[PDB]
Amino acid sequence: VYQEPTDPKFPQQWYLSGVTQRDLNVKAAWAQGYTGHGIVVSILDDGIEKNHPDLAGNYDPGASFDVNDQDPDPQPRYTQMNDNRHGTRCAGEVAAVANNGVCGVGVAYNARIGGVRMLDGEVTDAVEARSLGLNPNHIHIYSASWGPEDDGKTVDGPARLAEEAFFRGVSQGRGGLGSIFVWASGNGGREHDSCNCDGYTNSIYTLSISSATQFGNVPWYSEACSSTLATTYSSGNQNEKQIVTTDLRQKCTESHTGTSASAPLAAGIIALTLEANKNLTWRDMQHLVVQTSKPAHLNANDWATNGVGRKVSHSYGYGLLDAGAMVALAQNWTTVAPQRKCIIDILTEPKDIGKRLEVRKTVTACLGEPNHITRLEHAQARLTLSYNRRGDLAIHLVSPMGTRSTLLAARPHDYSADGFNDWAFMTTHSWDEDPSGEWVLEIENTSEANNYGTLTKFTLVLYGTASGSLVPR
């Protein structure tokens, strides 16, 4: 019979388990025997307190490096403000030691935990690449609770070295099965930011994770977008509980908050899943998340049923992660077929945007060719356009199965006249749909201003396979 942790703050970790059903169902995975043994997770952040009494027992120097100072020791830089506490808080969510009379427990409390000190300094492309590409045959899962500024006017993503690190990681990392990159979707809710304007979350190679409050609501800091894949609990208002984890200076905190807390919890759940089947590929893991995540009782006004019967929201992706269901489905998972990529150049001429532009195109999704896709995974609309005030644009993409993805919602603070330069807007909302048929792109001016611009390129990029479908939900 499984005995739950006795740690003093475990009763306050409302998001791990409970009679109430408002949790991530993590105790169910523990009771199946999965606690993270043998899995290695690295926190890419401002450092990790490797001697913390709730981390030392799981700490892994092979999962760690200091990119800011170019040494092996990721110890945080101590200051009066305790600025560099962020990575230690994230690490405890994944892998705080259990049953040791200290603080609470990690989701994967027997996993090995490291940290890359890379935020405490100028975060260049090279710095990112050296962190994302650290020891990729030892680290299984990378967790990143950082990104481009959430001011609601930035459009930015991985530069060349970081993108090369993503492709090297998913292609050759983890023995060719692919590094697992987990990303926090963003804290830009107050600025009406869109997490599709963030190339890290928008990447197909990352699992972008959003947040829900204890009472099941969209937190004030949440960013909505189509690239988000799933959700874990985090903070909300001051009547809602927060996240319990290890804090700087060997302390325990019950007030970890924001998007930053959601990605580590997802990384821990993914660690449990990898323990249940170490042969899962990076794409397998995304399939498991899509199939097992739970919308129930998460409140949103945009829940929609996609072409294969799954509920999907721009605030939550496919819903809350469910650790018990993840580890159960993982055990007899059949590896997905190799990934196909079908490139469809849509336009035959530039198109003036004006007040509203609708572009319709019927596609065969590479019918008759080795990259024929009947089973979609990610879809991208790679758009090149000029516009005089970017944040007045709203962009939607409708799949042949009728699923309307918001590629871009209005961003009131985005005054830029720089438009989009082959920006690869991504949606997860048509996962497992057949992409043959009519796609519709909609671009509209959401303001009364007499705005102007031109769409000059629209590449529809489809990823997926031609086999292995389930009967729709």
Partner: peptide, 4 residues
Amino acid sequence: RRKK
């Protein structure tokens, strides 16, 4: 360039 990048933020926590």
